[PDB]
Amino acid sequence: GHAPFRAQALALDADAALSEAFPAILGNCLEHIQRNEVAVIEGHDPETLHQMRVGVRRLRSALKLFDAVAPCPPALQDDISWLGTELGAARDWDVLLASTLPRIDANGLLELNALVQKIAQAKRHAAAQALLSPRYTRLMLTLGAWMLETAPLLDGSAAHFSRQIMQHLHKSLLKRAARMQDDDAASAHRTRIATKRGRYALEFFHGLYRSKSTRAYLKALAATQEELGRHNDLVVAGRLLQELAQQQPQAAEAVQFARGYLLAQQAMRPADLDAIRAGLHALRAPQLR
Ligand SMILES: [Zn+2]
């Protein structure tokens, strides 16, 4: 309520088992979602919604790496996708209003800003209703119950599991950054998600790896995510405004002006792959300690 909740720092023991790490990682993800509930329902704060959306993304990536040892039931995965879409739609409209539209310097953009704010507030109300619905509360309860049941069934230490995942994710990131080509949406998106997956996994198994080696690895990853995410916000804005033009034909002139400005920003300032390649060419897989 009122205050935004950021993901709690998870410091796992070096000698900790997989049966101890799995409920600690997923529990941290569920807490990150739960502690933002009230503020997303009652308020309109963008950071509280941002933190809840990130929490859902962190949970989905955690279930993806744990999929081999503990596969999540398909019914829960459908509800996680529903929750991600509901909070995601509200987040997309908030990014457009606070970050994508203000960087646009023809005079009819004031009424467009009022229309976008109206949609963003309505999407926040729609997200609030999704959280108050029994579908959400049942999902959080069923996920927690499944987490605790599957936890003692896992074999080996956390260090043995993390090294296999970290080797695959570093291999996946470097491969996608090399296969990456200019003006290709599919390759740029694959690199951005490999950057997110790698950042989350290293934050989950934080107390298992070297303090100064991971800090430099996370810095190079966060910089790559910031660059590819900047170009991604521009293409999402163009998609959201084109959808708004079809539903609201009255503000179409103001929409097309904003769409024209953003389409040019995509061509004039594309995702600087050369700076990304130079930022990731030196990176070595973080070693256990
Ligand atoms: Zn309201």
Residue numbers in the entry: 7 to 111, 117 to 289, 292 to 294, 296 to 303
What does the published report state?
Here, we report that bacterial, archaeal, and eukaryotic conserved histidine α-helical (CHAD) domains are specific polyP-binding modules.
We identified an expressed CHAD domain–containing protein in the plant R. communis L. (RcCHAD), which represents the only CHAD domain currently known in plants. We, thus, used the moderate anomalous signal present in the native RcCHAD dataset to locate a single Zn2+ ion. The structure was solved using the single-wavelength anomalous dispersion method, and the refined model revealed a Zn2+ ion tetrahedrally coordinated by His50 and His136 originating from two symmetry-related RcCHAD molecules. This makes it unlikely that CHAD domains are metal-binding proteins. Notably, helices α4/α5 and α10/α11 are protruding the bundle cores in the RcCHAD and CtCHAD structures, forming a small pore in the center of the domain, which we find to be absent in our ygiF structure.
